[PDB]
Design a protein around this ligand. Structure first.
Ligand SMILES: *[C@@H](C(=O)N(CCC(N)=O)NC(=O)[C@H](Cc1ccccc1)NC(=O)[C@H](CC(C)C)NC(=O)OCc1ccccc1)[C@H](O)C(=O)OCC
Ligand SMILES: *[C@@H](C(=O)N(CCC(N)=O)NC(=O)[C@H](Cc1ccccc1)NC(=O)[C@H](CC(C)C)NC(=O)OCc1ccccc1)[C@H](O)C(=O)OCC
Lengths: 304, 300
């Protein structure tokens, strides 16, 4: 009993964080080997952000326009270029703390840790999920842009996110580490169409499984359902449709707990219709959707 | 908008985590300068967790009886002693990654980050609070004992917690870095349980002030109250009664948001007596109590 959102330890990412400055704008950069990656809107002033022409703004810049600082040490920029919505700044020093890493583009519903930074200074870490509408529900203030999300896999840090914007509903939009936006968003300050978020059904089921592994079973029932009959109900409540490929992903948890996926679907179906009537599941009311099947497996078996 | 529990970056503390083994037991320890601190129950054995006699066990042990590993490096233990419920192992090497640090005793309602480890290896970081009943609602598995809790103030790690026990309700008991338990708990596998817990009103109000900073403002009402009146209510909802010193602490946020503490209390009193009616605060159904007034200021 007892289960909560955990982030990955952030030591390896913190040794990569730098401050990038252009004009009077400062934000955060990622220093790996001899490149710093950062949002290309570092080259925007006030007047630029409504409708920036980035190739225009960039041709007006030199290596020397960028001041990069790591700790108290200035790094010299000896090359710059733009990749989608990112700048790649080549520096004179290759980072001694660079970890094994890779860049990956993640999918809706997957989770990752975010190291939130201000002026290249790591300030907090938390865990969140890529929402079905390609936003993230983070916690960020002015100066956070350039913060990164990642996962750790054995020894290797997979970077999957770099923060760029806060939408007016309070959620956040950013890019992968090739600078491609998650979602239909652009790095201009103009109203943009977002899209109703939905509940990550696959994660809610993972989390019900986690409850069963930790001893909470009160919500189980001896019904079952069809995938299709489940989706009829779920879709009414703004849950994502459950695909057979989602069912296959839950196979391992099902095997381990002895509760068939469709039988767990039957449990969620009743939860959605009736609620919890006062009870909790892992200390929550509310069905939690930001733990993946892998999160649940990692955290119920404590992989380091 | 957008507001979340976050932990301090764990890097400074990852540098201090080591694996201590004695007999068949392996747990976590914290390596600062030339000392490793770990729970003394590391010297117990299957047979005698019910009534350990620690003073006996510790003479039976030589330095040899402890193996300490930092990554792939055995650390030679060269002194062992006990401070309350901790062991202090003197090692032959000073930890080169030792940070600036202090040991502090945290108080109920205060928050800290936890770095969860297995076999001296970092597994994850999450944020919690010392409950009023001296437990923490943590997330721990077998092998986690010795995992530590901390705050980071500027560049100084303040270590506040080290993990020892899981109680039958799934809550955790532990000690400060001098080995003194929080609560009336002991390091013996013996019937003992968390008293009833309360809600940390002080934090809930902090959180409401955050809400009405970040934009959420619907729960504010034309109503007023008295501490005395409010408290009588709080106590019927299993809330910690508010004190004057508590109100003095909310002054900043009260100064910043322009909402009198007692005014905010009257909003709380109402939410208690009437529910949230489906709507939310900061995207939460339910009122949150693991954000201190200091946390709010930091994350705003
Ligand atoms: C960078 C910074 O810290 N942040 C994070 C702010 C936060 N709390 O997360 N980023 C910004 O404020 C964006 C700056 C920008 C980027 C590209 C082009 C021009 C400006 N701006 C926004 O996030 C902006 C903030 C609102 C005005 C409050 N959001 C939107 O415009 O919403 C648009 C939208 C996008 C997608 C879907 C729907 C709508 C720091 O501010 C900085 O250094 O700026 C450099 C210019
Ligand atoms: C170390 C370890 O991981 N943990 C914590 C595990 C967790 N999920 O939090 N430490 C322990 O398990 C405690 C070990 C111990 C402490 C003192 C003396 C001897 C052994 N024991 C407990 O936490 C124990 C629960 C266990 C899961 C059985 N809790 C209680 O003792 O609660 C009191 C009680 C009430 C009612 C009935 C019985 C007991 C790892 O376990 C280790 O290294 O152990 C070394 C001895």
């Amino acid at each position: 009993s007892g289960f909560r959102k955990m982030a990955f330890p952030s030591g390896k990412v913190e040794g990569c964080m730098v401050q990038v400055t252009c004009g009077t704008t400062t934000l955060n950069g990622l220093w790996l080997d001899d490149t710093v990656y950062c949002p290309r809107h570092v080259i925007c002033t006030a007047e630029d952000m409504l409708n920036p022409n980035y190739e225009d703004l960039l041709i007006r810049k030199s290596n020397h326009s960028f001041l990069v600082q790591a700790g108290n040490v200035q790094l010299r920029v000896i090359g710059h270029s733009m990749q989608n919505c990112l700048l790649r700044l080549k520096v004179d020093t290759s980072n001694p703390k660079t970890p094994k890493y890779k860049f990956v583009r993640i999918q809706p519903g997957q989770t990752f840790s975010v190291l939130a930074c201000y002026n290249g200074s790591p300030s907090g870490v938390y865990q969140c999920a890529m929402r079905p509408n390609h936003t993230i529900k983070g916690s960020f203030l002015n100066g956070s842009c350039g913060s990164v999300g990642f996962n750790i896999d054995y020894d290797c840090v997979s970077f999957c996110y770099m923060h760029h914007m806060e939408l007016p509903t309070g959620v956040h939009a950013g890019t992968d580490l090739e600078g491609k936006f998650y979602g239909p968003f652009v790095d201009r300050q103009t109203a943009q169409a977002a899209g109703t978020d939905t509940t990550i059904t696959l994660n809610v089921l993972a989390w019900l499984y986690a409850a069963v592994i930790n001893g909470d079973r009160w919500f189980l029932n001896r019904f079952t359902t069809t995938l299709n009959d489940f989706n009829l109900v779920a879709m009414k409540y703004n849950y994502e449709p459950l695909t057979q490929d989602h069912v296959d992903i839950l196979g391992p948890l099902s095997a381990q707990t002895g509760i068939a996926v469709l039988d767990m679907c039957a449990a969620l179906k009743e939860l959605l219709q009736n609620g919890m009537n006062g009870r909790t599941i892992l200390g929550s009311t509310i069905l939690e959707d930001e733990f993946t099947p892998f999160d649940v497996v990692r955290q119920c078996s404590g992989v380091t």
